[PDB]
Amino acid sequence: APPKTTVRWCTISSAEEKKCNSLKDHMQQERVTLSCVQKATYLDCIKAISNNEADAISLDGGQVFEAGLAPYKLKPIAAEVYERSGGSTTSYYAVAVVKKGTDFMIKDLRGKTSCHTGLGRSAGWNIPIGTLIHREDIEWEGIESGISEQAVAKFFSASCVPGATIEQKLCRQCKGDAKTKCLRNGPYSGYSGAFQCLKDGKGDVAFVKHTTVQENAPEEKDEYELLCLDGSRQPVDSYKTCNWARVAAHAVVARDDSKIDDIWSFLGMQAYSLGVDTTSDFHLFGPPGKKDPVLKDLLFKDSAIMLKRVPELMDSQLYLGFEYYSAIQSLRKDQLTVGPRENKIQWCAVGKDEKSKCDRWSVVSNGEVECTILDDNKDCIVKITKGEADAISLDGGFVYTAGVCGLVPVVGESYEDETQCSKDEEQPAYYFAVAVVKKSSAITWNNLQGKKSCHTAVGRTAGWNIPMGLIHNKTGSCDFDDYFSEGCAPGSPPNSRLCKLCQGSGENLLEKCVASSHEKYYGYTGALRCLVEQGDVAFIKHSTVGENVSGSNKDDWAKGLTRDDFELLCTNGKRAKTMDYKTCHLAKVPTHAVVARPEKANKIRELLEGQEKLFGLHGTEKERFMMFQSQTKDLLFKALTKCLVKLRQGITYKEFLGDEYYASVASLNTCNPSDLLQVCTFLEDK
Length: 686
Prior knowledge:
Blueprint: E1 6-11, H1 14-26, E2 33-38, H2 42-50, E3 57-59, H3 61-67, E4 74-81, E5 94-99, E6 113-115, H4 122-135, H5 152-155, E7 158-160, H6 169-172, H7 190-199, E8 205-209, H8 212-216, E9 224-228, E10 232-235, E11 251-255, H9 260-273, E12 306-309, H10 316-319, H11 321-332, E13 346-350, H12 352-364, E14 370-374, H13 377-385, E15 392-394, H14 396-404, E16 408-414, E17 434-437, E18 453-455, H15 461-475, H16 523-533, E19 537-540, H17 545-548, E20 567-569, E21 575-577, E22 593-596, H18 598-615, E23 643-646, H19 653-671, H20 675-682
Parallel strand pairs: 1-2, 6-7, 6-8, 13-14, 18-19
Antiparallel strand pairs: 3-11, 4-11, 4-12, 5-8, 5-9, 9-10, 15-22, 16-22, 16-23, 17-19, 17-20, 20-21
Helix pairs in contact: 4-11, 14-19, 15-19
PDB class: transferrin
Keywords: transferrin, iron uptake, protein crystallography, molecular replacement
Assembly: monomeric
């Protein structure tokens, strides 16, 4: 994006300043130049960027946290990347290691012996302790002038918490003398130390990082375990699904309301003229043969290989993820201890209307569920990723995204009050997507390029998303238009070949290509007629043939129509009888489901099953409020929802959606991803 601006990098050390001007010298010659301002505290720097003296700095997981807090809401615009065998990464993970065979899981740390890395260390203090604070377990609430932080003594019978000088049982298990055992360097300190402690039977849990079991014990790793927050243990290598939280990489941060593009543009050029391989000398990351301590990690970590940009919708809170953010809430902010799941659900709504209905919900449930409001589905997910909201009913599409953002399906919407409902329920009954055609057994799926297709409307499942998704799987281009010769896809941009055949209102002038019933070929029906007047391939749902053909639609285009006139295009290449669906289909698009974070999952489940007994299709109080009836239509649930099918514990979105739909969407979305899927993709790393 175009300028000739300087960028004021901030340094807090002279050494740092040293390479900062070394940097600038290398490219006085470019559009976006650099400036160096040194200060004493990262923190000053923070405020020196909130007041516009400066432009960017590289923060640490916890630093970047407070840089985000008002009055400076500086946001991470760029993070580092670090791997060797694997590829690349924007993270590391703290674990709680236990010994295999001792049989306690996370509720049971009350009165354990613990081994830690040091006081005020993220891995060994902040994460575990703050977690255990938010859950309840360590009961710390309101430090105004309440004796405080080292209350963990009341929780754990003994510990080894290095460099603590405020208690004594926390110093108890430290190996050494007495004066040196609780020193910050007292030998059970740091990572390895905390591990040895545990190996010395001096703990029950060493709160550490993942690599440690390989680092200290690669022989006997198999004797050790992880203690996860869902109340389970998992082996050493299952860390990615068992971490207490992943101190997401070092972030360059800057102002929201500013010239960030310029800074990323400098970091960009710099990043790799003078990169990981500089043909010669100024390095921007240069890490070896143990250099002097004050030399290393100036400006960026030397470990770094790569500076990757942050998706613009990202904020401190999202980047750091949940886990860490809330751990830092706990100790870094107030004493907050009897509410992990404060047994009562913030349902997150879209649009005032939705709110109104949720307000009804609120009331009649006697406040079991409370309500938040937004302007978007986009947004409600973020309030769910951020723990400001709990659950939302999502569409098949939305589900994928949220599922990528780690929201798991809970109850799926079923629309037949007669089929899948309790015992009755097996999985909720989706509908199909199928490409219908006529006689000419010339046409097949893999030969479809360049034919004339008719589509329901763009942005719709049936007519647009599934065919085009699948098709893009095959092509690798976001070419849409330029795949078929021409066809109809309502609301296409009128120069688009997929507006060529559209007839608008009959053919009297008016609305040649609108996605509305003021267009001749709109909807499933319109498109079935569109196979009939002009198109070669129709993309629709499986009920469309058998809803208009043999004396079902009495419009003149349809008058002589009967089902052997239309066949199904199978994906495998073959064709079939319209009347033959579960076997021949493009995709079986599942219902809406509600998603939340895994933690909220099983209670959400209960909420609704209760709420339904009272306000669903044969509810106890349904005269006050019908959970499923709306003042308009799809207000919270899909108006002609019948019952709420329980999906079994920990369902993957992928399972819920099935391989066909999952493939459709995933491919369609490599084309032009939205802001939210982008971030959820970056934090699939997290």
